[PDB]
Amino acid sequence: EVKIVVDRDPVKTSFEEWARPGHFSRTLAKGPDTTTWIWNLHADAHDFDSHTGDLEEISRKVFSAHFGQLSIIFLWLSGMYFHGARFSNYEAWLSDPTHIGPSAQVVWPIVGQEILNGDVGGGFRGIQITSGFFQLWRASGITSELQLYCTAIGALVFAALMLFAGWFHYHKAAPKLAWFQDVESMLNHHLAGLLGLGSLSWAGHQIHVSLPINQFLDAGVDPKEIPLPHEFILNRDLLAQLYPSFAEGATPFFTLNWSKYAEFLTFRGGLDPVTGGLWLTDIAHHHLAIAILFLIAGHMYRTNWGIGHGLKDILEAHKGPFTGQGHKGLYEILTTSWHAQLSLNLAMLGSTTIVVAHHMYSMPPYPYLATDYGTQLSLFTHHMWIGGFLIVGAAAHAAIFMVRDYDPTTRYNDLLDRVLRHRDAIISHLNWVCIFLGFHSFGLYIHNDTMSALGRPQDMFSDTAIQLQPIFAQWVQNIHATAPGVTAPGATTSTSLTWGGGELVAVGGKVALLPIPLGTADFLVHHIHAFTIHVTVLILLKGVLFARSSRLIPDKANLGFRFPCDGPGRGGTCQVSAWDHVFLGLFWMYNAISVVIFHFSWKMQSDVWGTISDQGVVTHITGGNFAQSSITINGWLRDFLWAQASQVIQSYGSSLSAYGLFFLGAHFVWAFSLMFLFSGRGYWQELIESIVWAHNKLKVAPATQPRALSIIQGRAVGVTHYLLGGIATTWAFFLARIIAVG
Amino acid sequence: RQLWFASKQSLTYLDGTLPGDFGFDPLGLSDPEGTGGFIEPRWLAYGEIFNGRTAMMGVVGMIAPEALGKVGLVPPETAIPWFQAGAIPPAGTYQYWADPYTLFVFEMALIGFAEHRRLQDWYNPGSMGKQYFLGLEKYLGGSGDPAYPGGPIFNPLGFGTKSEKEMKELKLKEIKNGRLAMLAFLGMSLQAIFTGVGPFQNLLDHLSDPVNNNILTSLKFH
Amino acid sequence: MRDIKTYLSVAPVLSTLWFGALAGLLIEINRLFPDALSFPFF
Amino acid sequence: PERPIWFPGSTPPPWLDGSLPGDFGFDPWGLGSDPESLRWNVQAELVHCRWAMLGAAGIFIPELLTKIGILNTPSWYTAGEQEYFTDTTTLFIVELILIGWAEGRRWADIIKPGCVNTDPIFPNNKLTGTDVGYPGGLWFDPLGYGTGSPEKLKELRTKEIKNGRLAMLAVMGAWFQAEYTGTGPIDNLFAHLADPGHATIFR
Ligand code: CLA
Ligand SMILES: CC(/C=C/C=C(C)/C=C/[C@@]12O[C@]1(C)C[C@@H](O)CC2(C)C)=C\C=C\C=C(C)\C=C\C=C(C)\C=C\[C@@]12O[C@]1(C)C[C@@H](O)CC2(C)C
Ligand SMILES: CC1=C[C@H](O)CC(C)(C)[C@H]1/C=C/C(C)=C/C=C/C(C)=C/C=C/C=C(C)/C=C/C=C(C)/C=C/C1=C(C)C[C@H](O)CC1(C)C
Ligand SMILES: CC1=C(C/C=C(\C)CCC[C@H](C)CCC[C@H](C)CCCC(C)C)C(=O)c2ccccc2C1=O
Ligand code: SF4
């Protein structure tokens, strides 16, 4: 059945191994042969799979390790709440959120660096933040420095709880294997307990605290006089003075007269004109609706009583003619291998983060988030990068599974077999498309640029010339605009304001949203994204399929997951290891994402954001030039890189100086990485030797013999810096630009 | 051996030798296959009897002071429903010889001596009658059963004088009473949230008017 | 006790302790003799 | 072995065996797990036992006697700020030298027992103590009182540590009380005597 059998004191808490570096691995433990040793110490620190050969210990280590990862997050949260309480103009920000920048960092004045303390207003100074906590603390009705302090302590305590918990469950009472593999109950609790009861509890706090309090601040009152949140929960008559449905108590909920709670549980849609965010009634309803759906879904898989499904039997009924044995056997290979689960989870959590970034800019959920141009740009950019990386990780661990855990004599699967057998078709067809999109997406930009350069602006691809109208997006925009009429009679308005119809929402002389048009200039760039996404898929997919064998090397599996090459024979076999396919994917992931966050930044400044006249005419930040200048490659140079880098470049001598330095500093690191990617090891090894000789002359030759980095480390350092230089350069480019213009 | 809502798992280990047994256990807890901490069938039994005993004096104090305020010679000042005695300030309080939070720490220290020593005898039988404790060591060794230490300080006259059946009969009475009190205290609470007029009053509300039946009403007030 | 001291003697732990002390020292000197473009004692 | 333990019924650590005066088997973290650190730490606890004993005498006795009207001593808390016959700095400097002399020689005895006990000037002034940390001699035992049988010194030394531990808590008592209460230690005693159940940390 399903029970809790654990062990007692597997590994004794002691400090011995803390003074025996490289104890975990048998190879590393003998000592530092050369400096190659101190690099292999960290490269194999967390690879629990290579230390031991059984699933039980690997499990207990990953289970306890997560507790550490969970603990750090709490400590990270604790600082953010603490800092917002002791070093912020939050309470001032609650008075005029429209035109006082959120600041929650203050620097010590040592070497003149107090120039960084910007005049964010509100009688305060400091680094203007952009993570947008302030809109999060207002949407939860905090309205006090004291309440930000107590949660900071509460957040800190849990960190000690988690960190303690990690210790307890690896040294004192560690679970057994049978505990881990019972994945029906695993899903059963997470769906009902974590996901389900998480929302319902939160839908609680919104009903009794965030809603009635924020309804005071939105109504307009000084924060200091809002009765404390435990007054409503005690004095039930106060909730009556706003929400008369709270007189009858919770009995309508029990008599199915649910249309009595219509005051604070609605289906409005749209955005709030006062605060530019969603209607907290909808949000209040939303988590409640989600709560029920998850909770019921929790009760599906059989755990201990008669009722419930069997995850094994579900996978063993779907087998088709084209597919053969179908999903039989996938239960094992998804249960006796952590690298399978980590690869599968990474892709979904990777994808979801992206969808988060597409929704949070079009349905602004927190109050006074819409007119916070510094926040919108950062939050959209941040989760794109997070979403991009995690997807690449799903390729690496899927590739690792093919090399280490896959075995067609015991863990045999049929679908994963058929997929292997026709892999030549899969890559070649994906190869042709990546070429097709390559010619018809970039080429149109090149042809546009050539014709424009020759004085033929009537042969370019644009709205004023040969036209390419996205109709399919223009059609679906139409449908969502008229959905409130027929196909969703409950809704008062559309689910957003970017649908091809409606009206803008103005908050304090700053546009929240308005219908986003889709002309030709948008059609091209959407087919750029379809191109770089496909190419990135090609590299990672090729790595996963060919991680065990190919027509070049027939025994690549025997060489492991990350090996440099197989020598210069057969024409040259540099970079055939699956690790080097993900190594290549990173650049395209860095390429796909970068154009997306360029596309978002220009489209919103040119077509959406911007001030609004008192009369009613709207003037966007860049004057609406995206629809004409974004179709020529030179256009992306003049009017985006050259014209929107002005603020970062001349940011010297004012609080935005720290961005001016990072802008340069990130170039230096980017250009630095090239030394590792372009060159090779055998040159650096020899130059090291001559340097080593001079130290022999003066007797200062070390005993950990100097060595050059290993082949796959020269690449690993090469890509890491390149990514760090590329991402940070955009970081300093964006924040300094948007903070100055809005 | 009367069984109530038994289960195949339950009757593999609930042998009935433990007093208060009725073979009721559908959540895998007392299962002896899985024993880390706090899931030992002894410890759970140890926590079962203690919680009951705390309930057996917790319940009576949860209805004594107001009901004794119904006729008794208690001056009405210290005759109050239990939740307004001072435990829950938002329900009310009363000014005792102290001011609160000094009563707490005093209480937590006095409890600390009895509690921790009460814990050690579970870890190390007979240990608490070895180191010097101002005399009294002759008793604090216990009889070897942590839940039933015995001794002239704990079992002064001595019942269960000599009869295991009686003791088994007695301990059966001790748990079923314990279960009765735990549920009862859970009654005095959930009544308070909904009724909000005090425990013993809420029995009169159903006495003078059985048609009250606050279930159907479900009005909430402090 | 011996094992704790040995661990505290491994290279990375000394580095942060050593450099941290060095950072504190330089910051203090710049707090007391700021701008310091020349060495005007002799 | 069967000596009283801080936590009765617990198993004391092996390196604590009751030999040393004041060994109630208390070392949860094992700071004295290895013999050498124990040896040094024994000294550390010993001297800390003597300083606070004077400090407890230094704080409580004058504040007591000034609370009643017999004298004029101010608060120990602001005792440093007071201006005496010269600047504080030089007196501290003078304190640096002279203490460094004893804290120098004491240091030599610690690292090398028995190599410091003879007077550098008048060599017939040799000190009599044999145990590290117990100098003996006519300067520090004007009548002996340390040269006795065991089970008496062990009693006496335990009467020296057990008081010292009582001091170190008390002076840190006078420390934190002066910070979050506004008055001297004796007031914190009396205001706790008028309403013991009300006037505490919880104001
Ligand atoms: C600016 C630099 C650059 C360019 C142009 C390319 C171009 C290409 N790379 Mg690539 N790559 C680069 C940098 C670049 N890479 C870097 C730095 C890396 C390291 C990370 C990689 C890593 C990499 C990998 C790993 C892969 C590619 C792939 C591809 C090809 C897919 C795109 C395609 O088919 O479009 C078609 C070609 C173009 C759009 C180029 C412009 C052509 C224009 C439209 C017209 C050209 C003139 C015309 C022919 C007239 C001829 C004139 C006559 C006189 C001759 C393409 C050839 C993928 C591939 O080949 O598989 C599909 C692939 O798997 N590259
Ligand atoms: C409390 C203290 C040290 C306490 C140490 C503790 C608890 C450690 C406990 C543990 O390690 C063990 C035991 C075992 C581990 O396994 C467990 C833990 C728990 C980790 C030192 C105080 C030590 C206190 C001292 C030394 C006090 C000295 C007083 C002095 C010097 C005099 C000061 C004055 O001169 C001024 C300043 C001003 C004048 O006006 C007034 C006077 C008073 C005259
Ligand atoms: C068995 C099983 C098995 C399966 O498998 C599953 C399931 C079924 C789930 C399970 C079940 C379980 C259960 C039911 C349990 C319960 C318990 C309880 C209730 C306890 C209480 C318990 C309770 C208790 C102790 C209580 C106590 C109390 C007290 C002291 C009181 C006190 C007081 C008073 C007087 C007055 C003042 O002024 C206040 C106060 C202070 C407040
Ligand atoms: C530059 C370069 C090197 C040389 C880089 C080396 C040898 C490592 C860089 C030196 C590091 C920083 C060691 C210095 C840190 C030591 C621990 C000493 C610390 C002392 C400091 C506190 C001063 C390679 O080894 C290499 C290998 C493969 C492909 C490309 C390259 C490559 O491009
Ligand atoms: S160049 Fe390097 S990677 Fe390529 S074959 Fe030679 S050794 Fe291998």
Coordinates of C-alpha atoms in Angstrom, one line a residue, chain B residues 67-209:
Chain B
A67 CA -21.5 27.6 35.8
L68 CA -20.3 28.0 39.3
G69 CA -21.1 31.6 38.6
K70 CA -24.7 30.4 38.1
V71 CA -25.3 29.6 41.8
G72 CA -21.9 29.2 43.5
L73 CA -20.3 31.3 46.1
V74 CA -17.8 32.6 43.6
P75 CA -17.9 36.4 43.5
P76 CA -19.1 37.1 40.0
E77 CA -15.9 39.0 39.1
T78 CA -14.0 35.8 38.5
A79 CA -17.0 34.0 37.1
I80 CA -16.6 34.4 33.3
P81 CA -17.0 32.2 30.2
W82 CA -13.7 30.4 29.5
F83 CA -12.5 32.3 26.5
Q84 CA -12.7 35.6 28.3
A85 CA -10.7 34.6 31.3
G86 CA -7.6 36.2 29.7
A87 CA -6.3 33.5 27.4
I88 CA -7.7 35.4 24.4
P89 CA -7.4 39.2 24.9
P90 CA -9.7 40.0 22.0
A91 CA -12.4 38.1 23.8
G92 CA -11.5 40.0 27.0
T93 CA -9.2 39.7 30.0
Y94 CA -9.0 40.1 33.8
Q95 CA -6.4 41.7 36.0
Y96 CA -4.9 39.0 38.2
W97 CA -2.1 39.5 40.7
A98 CA 0.3 39.6 37.8
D99 CA 0.2 41.4 34.5
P100 CA 0.2 38.8 31.6
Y101 CA 3.4 37.5 30.0
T102 CA 4.8 37.2 33.5
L103 CA 2.3 34.5 34.2
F104 CA 3.3 32.8 31.0
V105 CA 7.0 32.6 31.7
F106 CA 6.4 31.6 35.3
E107 CA 4.1 28.9 34.0
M108 CA 6.5 27.8 31.3
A109 CA 9.3 27.4 33.9
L110 CA 7.2 25.4 36.4
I111 CA 6.0 23.2 33.5
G112 CA 9.6 23.0 32.3
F113 CA 10.8 21.0 35.3
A114 CA 7.8 18.5 35.2
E115 CA 7.7 18.3 31.4
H116 CA 11.4 17.7 30.6
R117 CA 11.7 15.2 33.4
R118 CA 8.5 13.6 32.2
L119 CA 10.3 13.3 28.8
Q120 CA 13.6 11.8 30.1
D121 CA 11.8 8.8 31.7
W122 CA 10.5 7.9 28.2
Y123 CA 14.0 8.0 26.8
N124 CA 15.9 6.5 29.8
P125 CA 13.7 4.5 32.1
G126 CA 14.6 4.9 35.8
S127 CA 16.9 7.8 35.0
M128 CA 14.9 10.4 36.8
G129 CA 15.5 8.8 40.2
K130 CA 19.3 8.8 40.0
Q131 CA 20.7 12.3 40.0
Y132 CA 20.0 14.4 43.1
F133 CA 16.7 16.3 43.1
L134 CA 16.3 17.3 46.8
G135 CA 15.2 13.9 47.8
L136 CA 12.1 12.6 46.0
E137 CA 14.4 10.5 43.9
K138 CA 13.0 7.3 45.5
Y139 CA 9.7 8.0 43.5
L140 CA 10.7 9.6 40.3
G141 CA 12.0 6.3 38.8
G142 CA 8.7 5.2 37.5
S143 CA 7.4 1.7 37.1
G144 CA 8.9 1.3 33.6
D145 CA 5.8 2.2 31.6
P146 CA 6.1 5.9 30.7
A147 CA 2.4 6.5 30.4
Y148 CA 1.8 4.7 33.7
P149 CA 4.7 5.6 35.9
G150 CA 3.0 4.9 39.2
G151 CA 4.8 5.5 42.5
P152 CA 3.4 7.0 45.7
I153 CA 3.6 10.5 44.2
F154 CA 1.6 9.5 41.1
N155 CA -0.5 6.6 42.4
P156 CA -0.7 7.6 46.0
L157 CA -3.2 5.2 47.5
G158 CA -2.8 2.7 44.7
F159 CA -5.7 1.6 42.5
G160 CA -5.1 -1.2 40.2
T161 CA -4.0 -2.5 43.5
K162 CA -3.7 -6.1 42.2
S163 CA -5.8 -6.8 39.1
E164 CA -4.7 -6.5 35.5
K165 CA -8.2 -7.1 34.2
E166 CA -9.3 -4.2 36.4
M167 CA -6.4 -2.2 35.3
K168 CA -7.2 -3.2 31.7
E169 CA -10.8 -2.4 32.6
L170 CA -9.6 0.8 34.2
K171 CA -7.3 1.9 31.4
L172 CA -10.2 1.2 29.0
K173 CA -12.2 3.7 31.0
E174 CA -9.3 6.1 30.9
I175 CA -9.1 6.3 27.1
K176 CA -12.8 6.3 26.3
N177 CA -13.1 9.1 28.8
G178 CA -10.1 10.6 27.1
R179 CA -11.7 10.4 23.6
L180 CA -14.9 11.8 25.1
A181 CA -13.1 14.8 26.5
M182 CA -11.1 15.6 23.3
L183 CA -14.3 15.6 21.2
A184 CA -16.0 17.6 24.0
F185 CA -13.4 20.3 24.0
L186 CA -13.6 20.4 20.2
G187 CA -17.3 21.0 21.0
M188 CA -16.7 23.9 23.3
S189 CA -14.7 25.6 20.6
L190 CA -16.7 25.3 17.4
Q191 CA -19.8 26.3 19.5
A192 CA -17.9 29.4 20.5
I193 CA -17.0 30.5 17.0
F194 CA -20.6 30.2 15.8
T195 CA -22.6 30.8 19.0
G196 CA -20.3 33.2 20.7
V197 CA -22.2 33.3 24.0
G198 CA -20.2 30.8 26.0
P199 CA -20.4 27.0 26.3
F200 CA -22.8 26.4 29.1
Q201 CA -25.2 29.1 27.9
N202 CA -25.4 27.4 24.5
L203 CA -26.9 24.3 26.2
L204 CA -29.6 26.4 27.8
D205 CA -30.4 28.0 24.4
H206 CA -31.2 24.4 23.3
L207 CA -32.8 23.7 26.7
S208 CA -35.4 26.5 26.9
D209 CA -35.9 26.3 23.1

